[PDB]
């Protein structure tokens, strides 16, 4: 079924191609949502789509691109809202 998550990523996650790689992977996996940098140095975003696709993406988010160093992925499960496309915001 379609599900939604709000995620936060900590570590070496800005200046490492994280947003562009997240969008690339999200699209490959057939997900909608968005990703953005936060002032505290973390990355935040939303995934929305088939739960199997979301689960694969959460797996990916624990690594990110080779250059990243992800220390923690925080996940909040939410009701889908009708996200269209996967966008880099900010």
Curated annotation (Swiss-Prot):
Superkingdom, taxonomy of origin: Archaea
Residues of the Acylphosphatase-like domain: 4-90
GO molecular function: acylphosphatase activity; hydrolase activity
Record key words, sorted: Hydrolase
Thermal behavior of activity: Optimum temperature is 98 degrees Celsius. Poorly active at 25 degrees Celsius. Thermostable up to 100 degrees Celsius.
SUPFAM superfamilies reported in the protein's UniProt record: Acylphosphatase/BLUF domain-like (SSF54975)
Coiled-coil segments: none
Catalysed reaction, written as an equation: an acyl phosphate + H2O = a carboxylate + phosphate + H(+)
EC number(s) from the headed UniProt entry: 3.6.1.7
EC category: hydrolase
Stated pH dependence: Optimum pH is 5.3 at 25 degrees Celsius.
Active site, per annotation: 19, 37
Family: Belongs to the acylphosphatase family.
Subunit (UniProt): Monomer.
Name of this protein: Acylphosphatase
Protein species of origin: Pyrococcus horikoshii (strain ATCC 700860 / DSM 12428 / JCM 9974 / NBRC 100139 / OT-3)
């Amino acid at each position: 079924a379609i599900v939604r998550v709000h995620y936060k990523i900590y570590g070496r996650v800005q200046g490492v191609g994280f947003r562009w790689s997240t969008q690339r992977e999200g699209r490959k996996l057939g997900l909608n949502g968005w990703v953005r940098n936060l002032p505290d140095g973390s990355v935040e975003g939303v995934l929305e789509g088939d739960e199997e696709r979301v689960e694969a993406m959460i797996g990916w988010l624990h690594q990110g691109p080779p250059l990243a160093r992800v220390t923690r992925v925080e996940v909040k499960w939410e009701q889908p809202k009708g996200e269209k496309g996967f966008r880099i915001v900010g």
